[PDB]
């Protein structure tokens, strides 16, 4: 396989990049699509960032900082990360998320980057090339998953029922697992008590370009309800 | 007495209480940190991070100058450059958000009552809720209201309140529990779900934890900026 800083890796069938080693010690580095869900019991071992099953940590950055990423052309790209992006997947009932920085680039950019394009800080690995997100013409989001930025927000929360994800309407207001007028939500959140009957639960993420709503709920009782920036990847 | 677009008056606590805004009678009651209350009638008002307000706070942005009200009567103006986490119980709901916040001085906080109204562009925009000591001359001032773009709020029904528990250096977080990492690992696939309901609070100077639990069970954990006030 090829060598490049303290990594060594391989390419796919699908033309996705598999990192063997970091460090000359054996890895396990396995990138999912925005908002997919496996089961496969042999990954909670791992670690989870969203977007990535892996065997090494990816560390912490900094927004504004520089970072490197593999080309196909062999050669490395600069970047730095000056936006951000919300990610997620959902592995054996465990849906992972966050806002993860995220450079920039264009349309000729982008297609020299493979699905698992080491990224490196310095000479050493700090994250992988996991998924792309059009912010318009010309223009790509590239998220660098790994350990929640200082200022930003990651988590996780078991979903029985998986990640139901709806797009946010305008001048709706949100609760549990609806989206109606303003009036109406808070005439039903003062209404609503833990007793829907063969009440199932729910998680529901609803998007629009700017912001993100995650609620958890049993039945129709919301649990919690979670704000956060945008945009989703989809 | 009159500033700008509102009404106000003081308390026998010294604390600022907002009488009408737009010259329609207003509601503003301001919730210590962590305060846990019950009073059904505050759910019919808005709620952010330490205040119960019929009047909406609205969304600022971080690095904008907004403007105080000073014990004085004169205003201080003040610049939005950093963040801090608060958050209040009301009726059995854990309301929460990390809030853009200026930074003060030990003259300038003393100036500044709890209540005290908060302006951008001569329209009130929060009130004074809580002061967060940073080091021996310098505060936090968070300014509650409606999510800043970049930040993140929400609210959770907690049953049996909120636990808040200093977070230990070498402890990873699942559940009810901060453990070293290989436990914490084992442990979270060991759960499986009279186990009550749970949620926790662990707070460090840089990050802060919530889980939501039932039992022993570990149903959410948030990772999100700090310091708690
Ligand atoms: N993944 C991740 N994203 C972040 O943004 C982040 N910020 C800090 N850290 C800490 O860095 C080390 C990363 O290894 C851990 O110390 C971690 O502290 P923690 O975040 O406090 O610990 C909870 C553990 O526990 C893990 N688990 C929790 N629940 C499960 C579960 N059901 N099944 C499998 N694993 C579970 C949880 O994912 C996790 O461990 P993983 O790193 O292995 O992902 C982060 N970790
Ligand atoms: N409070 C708050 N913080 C923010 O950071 C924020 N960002 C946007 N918005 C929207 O701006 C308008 C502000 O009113 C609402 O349209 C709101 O949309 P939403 O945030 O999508 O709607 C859910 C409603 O519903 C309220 N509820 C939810 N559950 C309850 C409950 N048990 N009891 C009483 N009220 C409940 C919930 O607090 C809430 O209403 P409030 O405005 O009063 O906060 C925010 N609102």
Known sequence: ???????????????????????????????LEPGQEVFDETLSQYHQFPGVVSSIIFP?????????????DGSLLTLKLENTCFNFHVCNKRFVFGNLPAAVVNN?????????????????????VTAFHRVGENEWLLPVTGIREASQLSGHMKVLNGVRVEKWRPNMSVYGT?????????????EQENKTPNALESC???????????????????????????????
Do not use: C, W
Not at 108 to 128: C, D, H, M, N, Y
Not at 184 to 189: L, P
């Open 178 to 190: 609806v989206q109606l007028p303003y009036d109406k939500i808070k005439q039903h959140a003062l």
């Open 60 to 72: 912490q950055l900094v927004l504004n900082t520089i970072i490197s990423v593999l080309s196909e």
């Open 204 to 234: 529901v993420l609803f998007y629009k370009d700017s912001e993100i709503r995650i609620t958890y709920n049993k039945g129709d009782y919301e649990i919690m309800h979670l704000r956060m920036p945008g945009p989703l990847i989809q």
């Open 1 to 31: 396989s090829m060598e490049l800083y303290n990594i060594k890796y391989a390419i796919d069938p699908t033309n996705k990049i598999v990192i063997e080693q970091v460090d000359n010690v054996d890895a396990f580095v396995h990138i």
């Open 108 to 128: 000729e950019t982008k297609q020299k980057l493979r699905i698992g394009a080491p990224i490196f800080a310095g000479k050493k690995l700090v994250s992988v």
